[PDB]
């Protein structure tokens, strides 16, 4: 028994509709300033951004903005260096348990594939992040819990992380809770499928090529099968 | 193989060259009538079963929900 | 056109040459045309 998030009119919902890359950039900013404290985008590395919403040198900037340790040194373990374009996003709580502790038993789930891993993810995400409503009568959430009608059980350890104007969008687009939830849902989506755009272009070329090739192959088949389909049989007993 | 497949007699068989005949003779001219002829010939033997399927499907889903529904008298 | 059959379709070799050459250029045209479409459909959303 769970609330089933509704269908939202996403800009990538259509059959050939790509992602809005400004929204992916804003959602990456939302993840960097809010979501990165507990969740780990393990499978997304700074380099990945180049080509989507940040240019090579631009990405380098972001990369240079983090300290990543280099374990093997002549005699030492870690002089975290300026993270590079080859470095993956920095996971908070190096060990899972660490977070468990920090989040009161909860383990923020790595949001790299969250949208893909959650049924109706994009919607779910938006709903969960925006579904922090009032608990009803009779409910008795355990210590360190909050109430979201969507989350399985309606008892997500995650406290509501998006308060209106939680962070300021560099683009200046008003940082309303929603504008922030929609941006981070687009970004997480991108994260779970960096190739969304490239694919849809392949699908458009595939539809054009099949629309060219199916009637022509049908015409060749009907040529080579007309002979028989016109064959007239006659029985002429002597 | 061919030549030893079967024995027929006095069955003449005329035919035409592919390039000599129209590719889609009366394609939609008779195709539609025929497709329609065909469906009415098996529709009564194909659809009926699946119709009932849609029905069981629906009834099943609704019934389940009702089961989940809280019993009014429950707790009251 | 009966020039086609005589120049392109008639000899298998010629029938081929035309296919290969056409295909060589078709890609250029198809990709270009297709890209124009894709982009426009989502003109607003793309890096640039």
């Amino acid at each position: 028994l769970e609330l089933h998030p509704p269908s939202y009119p996403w800009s990538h919902r259509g059959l050939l509709s790509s992602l809005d890359h400004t929204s992916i950039r804003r959602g990456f900013q939302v993840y960097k300033q809010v979501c990165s404290s507990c969740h780990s985008m393990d499978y997304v590395a700074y380099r990945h951004l180049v080509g989507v919403c940040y240019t090579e040198e631009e990405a380098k900037a972001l990369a240079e903005e983090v300290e990543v340790q280099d374990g093997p040194n002549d005699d030492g373990e870690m002089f975290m260096r300026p993270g590079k374009l080859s470095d993956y996003f920095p996971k908070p709580y190096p060990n899972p348990e660490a977070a468990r502790a920090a989040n009161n038993g909860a383990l923020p789930p790595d949001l790299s594939y969250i949208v893909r891993a959650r049924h109706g993810g994009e919607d779910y995400v938006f709903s969960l992040l925006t579904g922090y409503c009032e608990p009803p009568t009779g409910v008795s959430l355990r210590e360190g819990l909050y109430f979201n009608p969507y989350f399985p059980g309606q008892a997500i350890g995650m406290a509501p992380p998006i308060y209106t104007e939680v962070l300021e969008y560099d683009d200046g687009t008003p940082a309303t809770m929603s504008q922030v939830a929609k941006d981070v849902a687009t970004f997480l989506r991108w994260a779970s499928e960096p190739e969304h755009d490239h694919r849809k272009r392949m699908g458009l070329k595939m539809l054009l090529m099949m629309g060219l090739l199916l009637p022509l192959t049908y015409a060749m088949k009907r040529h080579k099968w007309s002979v028989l389909k016109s064959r007239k049989l006659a029985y002429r007993p002597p | 193989e061919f030549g030893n497949l079967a024995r027929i007699r006095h069955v003449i068989s005329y035919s035409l060259s592919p390039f000599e005949q129209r590719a889609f003779p009366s394609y939609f001219s008779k195709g539609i009538p025929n497709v329609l002829r065909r469906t009415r010939e098996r529709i009564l033997r194909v659809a009926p079963p699946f119709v009932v399927v849609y029905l069981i499907y629906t009834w099943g889903n609704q019934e389940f929900e009702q089961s989940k529904r809280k019993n009014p008298a429950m707790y009251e | 056109p009966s020039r086609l059959y005589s120049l392109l379709f008639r000899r298998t070799s010629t029938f081929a040459l035309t296919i290969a050459v056409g295909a060589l250029f078709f890609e250029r045209a198809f990709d270009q045309g297709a890209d124009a479409i894709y982009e426009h459909i989502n003109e607003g959303k793309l890096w640039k």
């Binding site: 016109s230 | 390039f19 009366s26 | -």
Partner: peptide
């Protein structure tokens, strides 16, 4: 014999100098 009947009509099939094009 073999001349009693003539090749059946294929007019609804047959198309309407042209071979080269065809």
């Amino acid at each position: 014999s073999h001349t009693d009947v003539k090749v059946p009509d294929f007019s609804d099939y047959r198309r309407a100098e042209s071979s080269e094009a065809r």
